[PDB]
Design a protein around this ligand. Structure first.
Ligand code: SAH
Ligand code: LYS
Length: 429
């Protein structure tokens, strides 16, 4: 298999970890390293357990020499340091472990400039950039405040590479879905890979303190044991959290960002309306392919587009039903305004890409390298969501007169054809 690995597997033995009731070994799979069943494994069969003595969570960093200096750092920042640190100690309790860890992943945080050019105009590129930058600052602020000061605990220098390394390791390895634990790293069940086969992301791991990894599916001897990293994440999110995406078009998403500008002559009243109904000055709406629009997107759109003619709805009189009206609809002008705004934004966005959906799809038809493959799937996906959105509002523009706006809804209850009320009027005075 692999010397460095052979070592890692031997170490787990001389620790009471890997015993005999452990149906799984390590091997070289298309996705790096994984866990292959040593013999038929059944659904919910405990695969392997790890002693908390071996975690790598804030509780461990706090209980180490640097625990003091990191005493006020954010949970992750603390683990970042811990990791960069232990990776240097020849007497580390994870010497064999780190000697197994991938130096890199296909997460966009490692992509070269050319590799990134393949995501030109994508939302993913934006998101990755932002994240890379943030992590940088936060990490450079760490160097000057903890690494350099305590030159006794941090002997060797520390580059951004080491930082992004630990950050990546953190975001692609740790198990956040756990109660009372959000960033736990477990050297054994670390090698478990992801598969679309697993459709029950309802924790493949439980706490007993120990880490019990139970296989969510029945596996025959020789085959790989997988798990579902996260059903709700988009391909954009999978692409950045780990270095991979799925073919499932339902994983494609594009998030729209709406806000009530302060330059809006009605900012104050509008913001009041939004907040009174669960929305902030700025609001993000995630749009997934083939899903119906998020509730709240249309009403908020109408709020944004409101305008002077209908500003009367922002009056105390309707503060108790305004959202309901926003939910139904305001007026033909309001609707038409917002529809155009969205359609234009979609067209504009669609134009930011350097490839057509056809070209992307022809490429997918050949052999694509890891990162290029990710970029192509991502961009095609986004173009689809973008087009779906424009498609939706194009229909709306057509049905611009089928909707019954505020005024019409008001005159619905007039009772023009009632009784000759004048006969009773004369019986009264
Ligand atoms: N379904 C999948 N397809 C491709 N890569 C995958 C994958 N599931 C997991 N991975 C890879 O493994 C990482 C999760 S940690 C799993 C251990 C890893 N296989 C190793 O050799 O060290 C991901 O960030 C990704 O790079
Ligand atoms: N992201 C997954 C765990 C991935 C583990 C990768 N080895 C979770 O939230 O549980």
């Amino acid at each position: 298999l692999s010397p460095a690995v052979q070592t890692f597997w031997k170490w787990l033995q001389e620790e009471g970890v890997i015993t005999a009731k452990t149906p799984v070994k390590a091997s070289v799979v298309t996705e790096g390293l994984g866990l292959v069943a040593l013999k038929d494994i059944s659904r919910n069969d405990v695969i392997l357990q790890v002693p908390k003595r071996l975690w790598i969570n804030p509780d461990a960093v706090a209980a180490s020499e640097i625990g003091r200096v990191c005493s006020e750092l954010k949970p992750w920042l603390s683990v970042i340091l811990f990791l960069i640190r232990e990776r240097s100690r020849e007497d580390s309790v994870w010497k064999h472990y780190f000697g197994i860890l991938p130096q890199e992943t296909d997460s966009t945080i490692y992509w070269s400039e050319e590799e990134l050019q393949e995501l030109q105009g994508s939302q993913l590129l934006k998101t990755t950039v932002s994240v890379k930058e943030y992590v940088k600052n936060e990490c450079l602020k760490l160097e000057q405040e903890i690494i350099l000061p305590n030159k006794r605990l941090f002997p060797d220098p520390v580059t951004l590479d080491d930082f992004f390394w630990a950050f990546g390791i953190l975001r692609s390895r740790a198990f956040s879905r756990l109660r009372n634990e959000n960033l736990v790293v477990v050297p054994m069940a670390d090698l478990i890979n992801h598969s679309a086969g697993v459709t029950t992301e309802d924790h493949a791991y439980e706490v007993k303190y120990l880490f019990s990894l139970k296989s969510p599916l029945s596996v025959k001897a020789g085959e790989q044991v997988y798990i579902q990293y996260d059903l709700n994440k988009s391909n954009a999110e999978l692409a950045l959290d780990y270095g991979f995406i799925e073919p499932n078009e339902n994983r494609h998403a594009y998030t729209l960002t709406l806000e009530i500008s302060e330059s809006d002559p009605f900012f104050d009243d509008k913001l009041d309306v939004a907040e009174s109904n669960g929305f902030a000055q700025t609001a993000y709406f995630d749009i997934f392919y083939n899903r119906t629009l998020p509730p709240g997107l249309l009403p908020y759109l109408r709020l944004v587009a409101l305008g002077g003619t209908d500003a009367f709805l922002l009056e105390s009189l309707f503060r108790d039903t305004i959202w309901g009206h926003l939910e139904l609809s305001v007026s033909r002008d309001n609707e038409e305004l917002l529809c155009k705004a969205v359609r234009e934004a979609c067209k504009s966005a669609l134009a930011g890409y350097h490839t057509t959906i056809e070209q992307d799809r022809e490429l997918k038809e050949g052999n694509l390298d890891s990162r290029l493959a990710i970029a192509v799937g991502i961009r095609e996906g986004e173009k689809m969501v973008l087009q779906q959105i424009d498609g939706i509002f194009e229909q709306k523009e057509l049905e611009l007169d089928q909707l019954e706006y505020y005024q019409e809804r008001r005159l619905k209850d007039l009772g023009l054809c009632g009784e000759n009320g004048d006969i009773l009027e004369n019986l009264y005075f």
